[PDB]
Paper text:
Glycylpeptide N-tetradecanoyltransferase 1, commonly known as N-myristoyltransferases (NMTs, EC 2.3.1.97), are universally conserved eukaryotic enzymes responsible for a major post-translational modification (PTM), myristoylation (MYR). NMTs are thought to transfer a C:14:0 acyl-CoA (MyrCoA) exclusively to the N-terminal glycine (Gly) of specific substrates. Here we report a series of high-resolution HsNMT1 structures co-crystallised with MyrCoA and reactive substrate peptides. These structures reveal snapshots across the entire catalytic mechanism including the reactive intermediate state, thereby providing the high-resolution map of MYR reaction chemistry.
To challenge the primary importance of the water molecule channel in mediating Gly2 deprotonation, we created two truncated NMT1 variants in which the last 2 or 3 amino acids were removed. Accordingly, using an in vitro MYR assay, we established that the truncation does not alter the protein turnover rate (kcat) and observed a significant reduction in the enzyme’s relative affinity to the peptide. This suggests that the C-terminus of the enzyme is also directly involved in correct peptide adjustment into the catalytic centre. HsNMT1ΔC3 displays barely detectable enzyme activity, and its 3D structure reveals different conformations of the N-terminal region of the peptide substrate. This indicates that the low measured activity of HsNMT1ΔC3 is due to the high Gly2 mobility, most likely induced by the large space created by the C-terminal truncation.
Author numbering:
A (entry chain C): 2 to 9
B (entry chain A): 104 to 410, 414 to 493
Write the structure that this text describes.
């Protein structure tokens, strides 16, 4: 996983 | 710095990526094939790094060197939009991700300071047979491109990309695949992360999520409350005897998408056989003893940069043939909830949009762009990305 997302 | 939106990507000029065999951003691609032919004589000498830096292939079987790598990644790798969370890499997870069948030591490409030997850079390649439209090709997966924070914006990333390209060229592979949260020339597909809260109190405490405008702390938990045990009949951990059928189900299921890996049975064993705090796979064995479905998600904790540690689950491969995917992923949520996970993450690729909203996933603020190196092909929708 090459991204770090949070709930927007 | 980076461009995260295609509209933001209109501003950027690519001094480096304009030199690489990748399609141009604005161009529409109606072809299938490589951007450039195979090079039949390969540069033998490593590319020049800036003064005071030298190459060193990382032997991950060495404990201290592997410690340098996760210490590098745990302190300098991918972050969220707000510099609040960073992936937390265990030594065993890196062995899982960086030593699949066919791994080569020279593809653990590190950069050290000459005078101190301190590790300040890394990039990786692992072998991967990729199915893309009507073509299957031996490629590599490039991952863990990492430059130490003190070395940023000094053009070290093009050198790692070009040196790892050379070491892959030496082994005869001319295409590569990689993912990233930033927009580069040129995404073959864009996938969106969604997040399913499992322990809302902790997630909200560390400000990973917020309460939607009008809920209370105790209301939020009831919304995301899950059964204490899974629904599906005969759900059980994957065992050694399941490796063939897991390979069989995965192979046939992936054929409907346009960007998938093509796994041997030994690669299937490596990537799916359960390892604690790394990968979990659960198969559905029916009343006849045949395995008809499986779900999987990998373990990749998040470090809380304010700071103690957020354990997150990432959907991996979920194959359904008789059990509804909605009920397969609902069992995944329940199984992850048991195991103590705080959040369950998944992208909107493959068939995942069919269950995301129904399973109370919330859309995330990060995209994942999929790219091919030296391969020109039309872009695809997220639901066609199976990688
Ligand atoms: C056949 C074999 C082929 C194998 C090779 C296939 C290609 C390999 C693809 C590798 C992808 C692997 C997937 C992953 O690992 S994605 C994970 C990368 N890690 C992070 O995003 C978090 C940590 N970040 C860093 O360490 C640095 O910020 C990185 C390393 C990202 C850039 O370091 P730095 O901050 O010091 O920048 P620079 O001054 O050295 O260099 C600036 C140039 O680099 C271009 N850039 C920036 N970010 C990326 C990026 N994420 N992929 C490709 N290129 C990128 C940038 O647009 C500019 O080019 P251009 O704007 O002039 O065009």
């Amino acid at each position: 996983g090459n991204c770090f997302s949070k709930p927007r | 710095g980076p461009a995260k939106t295609m509209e933001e990507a209109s501003k950027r000029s690519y001094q480096f990526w304009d030199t690489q065999p990748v399609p141009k951003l604005g161009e529409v691609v109606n072809t299938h094939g490589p951007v450039e032919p195979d090079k039949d004589n390969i540069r033998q000498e490593p590319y020049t790094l800036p003064q005071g830096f030298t190459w060193d292939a990382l032997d991950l079987g060495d404990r201290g060197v592997l410690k340098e790598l996760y210490t590098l990644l745990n302190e300098n790798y991918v972050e969220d939009d707000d510099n609040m969370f960073r992936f937390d890499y265990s030594p065993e997870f890196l062995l899982w991700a960086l030593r699949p069948p066919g791994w080569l030591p020279q593809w653990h490409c590190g950069v050290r300071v000459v005078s101190s030997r301190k590790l300040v850079g890394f990039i990786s390649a692992i072998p991967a047979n990729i199915h893309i439209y009507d073509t299957e090709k031996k490629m590599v997966e490039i991952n863990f491109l990492c430059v130490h924070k003190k070395l940023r914006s000094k053009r070290v990333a093009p050198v790692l990309i070009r040196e790892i390209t050379r070491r892959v060229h030496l082994e005869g592979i001319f295409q590569a695949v990689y993912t990233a949260g930033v927009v580069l020339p040129k995404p073959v597909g864009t996938c969106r992360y969604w997040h399913r809260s499992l322990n809302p109190r902790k997630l909200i405490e560390v400000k990973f999520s917020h309460l939607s405008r009008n809920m209370t702390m105790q209301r939020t938990m009831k919304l995301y409350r899950l059964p204490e045990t899974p629904k599906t009949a005969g759900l059980r951990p994957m065992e050694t005897k399941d490796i063939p059928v897991v390979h069989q189900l995965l192979t046939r299921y992936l054929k409907q998408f346009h960007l998938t890996p093509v796994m041997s049975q030994e690669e299937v064993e490596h990537w799916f056989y359960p390892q604690e705090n790394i990968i979990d796979t659960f198969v559905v064995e029916n009343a006849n003893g045949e395995v008809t479905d499986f779900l999987s998600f990998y373990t990749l904790p998040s470090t809380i940069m304010n700071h103690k540690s957020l354990k997150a689950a990432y959907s991996f491969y979920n194959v359904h043939t008789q059990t509804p995917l909605l009920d397969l992923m609902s069992d995944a949520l329940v199984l992850a909830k048991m195991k103590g996970f705080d959040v369950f993450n998944a992208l909107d690729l493959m068939e995942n949009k069919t269950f995301l909203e129904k399973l109370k996933f919330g859309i995330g603020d990060g995209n994942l762009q999929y790219y091919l190196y030296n391969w020109k092909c039309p872009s695809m929708g997220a639901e066609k990305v199976g990688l």
